């Protein structure tokens, strides 16, 4: 049962999430994310660091990127 969608501006950047099995975007650029068996999430820019939700993974990506555009 997928998490709810989200849309907000986090540290100046637009993060969006939606069920697909779940997609995340940072300023319109898709961010690879994955769900772990226990329900936590990671993204490709935090791939050894489980966080509880896809929004938390999106925010972690914005923290990691320090303003840099994501590459597809």
């Amino acid at each position: 049962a997928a998490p709810e969608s989200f849309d907000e501006v986090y540290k100046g950047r637009r993060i969006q999430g939606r069920p697909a099995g779940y997609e995340v975007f940072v300023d319109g650029v898709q961010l690879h994310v994955m769900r772990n068996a226990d329900g936590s999430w990671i993204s490709v820019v935090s791939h050894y660091d489980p966080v509880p939700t896809p929004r938390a993974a999106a925010r972690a990506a914005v923290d990691e990127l320090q303003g840099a555009p994501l590459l597809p």
Partner: protein, 276 residues
């Protein structure tokens, strides 16, 4: 053919290792290792096919990946072997690991850029090409995102786990492999990636040469576990969907099985490895 503790390398060994890594980068070969690792960590999932991570083959897969890299190093300088980083011991930014004659230090405050050592972007010798964002410089934040590297006592607790792996053979598993990988328990291998930060925290973590030294010590800890537990061995041993069984071959090579990689001594020895 002996893998040594990084802390024990001579100045000449450090120089030759650095030069061999930089030549693989220059020739283009290095970046394809970065790409291979990222492809696998983006595809290794708990509910589907999993080979390089979050699965029993995490250990033999990284063992063969490191052997590929070491053999590529040896094609440039046959004297070079992969050293290992015992992060239970060399656990500060002050470790000689992070000196300008070896890997360089942590990144500056502003953008995490590594400013010294042979891999600093300013040298012109370490472009980050395989990447998930626009930044093309090596980054690190040693101890930024997690305060502490594992300790020896935490390591010992993991080495004491007798079963190699357990169903469901993923990031939810009990047993040695998943505690060493770190998805459960006090967290060894994952936490080191997080502690280094920068590209080492990401799918393109081999962009940092410390990747190899971290995985060479993870690999050494598997060898140590084997000595502690001669009565335990790789599982599963056949017929397990989505997971590499003992005698099944592994991607990307397709011609090698976990069974072919259990005994490191076929390929290398350590400077020191305790008898059972």
């Amino acid at each position: 053919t002996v893998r040594k503790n990084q802390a024990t390398l001579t100045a000449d060994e450090k120089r030759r290792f650095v030069a061999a890594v930089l030549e693989l980068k220059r020739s283009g070969r290095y970046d394809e290792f970065v790409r291979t690792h990222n492809e696998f960590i983006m595809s290794d999932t708990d509910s589907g096919e999993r080979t390089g991570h979050r699965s029993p083959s995490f250990l033999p897969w990284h063992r063969r990946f490191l052997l590929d890299f070491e053999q590529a190093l040896q094609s440039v300088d046959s004297s070079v072997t992969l050293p290992y980083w015992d992060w239970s011991a060399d656990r500060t930014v002050r470790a000689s690991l992070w000196a300008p004659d070896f890997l360089g230090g942590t990144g500056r405050s502003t953008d995490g850029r590594v400013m010294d050592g042979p891999f600093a972007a300013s040298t012109g010798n370490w472009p980050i090409n395989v990447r998930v964002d626009s930044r093309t410089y090596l980054r690190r934040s040693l101890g930024g995102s997690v305060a502490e590297l594992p300790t020896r006592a935490e390591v010992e607790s993991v080495l004491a786990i007798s079963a190699y792996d357990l169903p469901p053979y993923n990031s939810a598993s009990e047993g040695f492999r998943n505690h060493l990988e770190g998805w459960r328990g006090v967290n060894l291998h994952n936490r080191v990636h997080v502690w280094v930060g920068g590209q080492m925290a990401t799918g393109v973590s081999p962009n940092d040469p410390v990747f190899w030294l971290h995985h060479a010590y993870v690999d050494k800890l598997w060898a140590e576990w084997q000595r502690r537990h001669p009565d335990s061995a790789y599982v599963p041993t056949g017929g397990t969907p989505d997971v590499v069984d003992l005698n099944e071959t592994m991607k990307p090579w397709n011609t090698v099985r976990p069974a072919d990689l259990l005994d490191h001594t076929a390929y290398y020895t350590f400077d020191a490895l305790e008898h059972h």
